[PDB]
């Protein structure tokens, strides 16, 4: 029933989230901050099932 009724999903794409993270975490590029590196490899192909 949930699958049949919950048709779409609402979320913000990755680009905006990365921009916000960059603005909030004002750090020079070329410094190897793993907080920024880890998120850069994400995606939301699977959001409906989750």
């Amino acid at each position: 029933l949930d699958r049949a009724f919950l048709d779409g999903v609402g979320f913000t794409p990755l680009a905006e989230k990365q921009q916000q993270l960059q603005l909030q975490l004002k750090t020079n590029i070329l410094t190897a901050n793993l907080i920024r590196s880890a998120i850069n490899g994400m995606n939301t192909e699977s959001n409906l099932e989750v």
Binding site: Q18, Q22, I29, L30, R36, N40
Partner: peptide, 12 residues
């Protein structure tokens, strides 16, 4: 081969 060159992947 002699001069290593790296680049930023997707932060660009």
């Amino acid at each position: 081969s002699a001069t290593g060159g790296q680049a930023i992947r997707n932060v660009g």
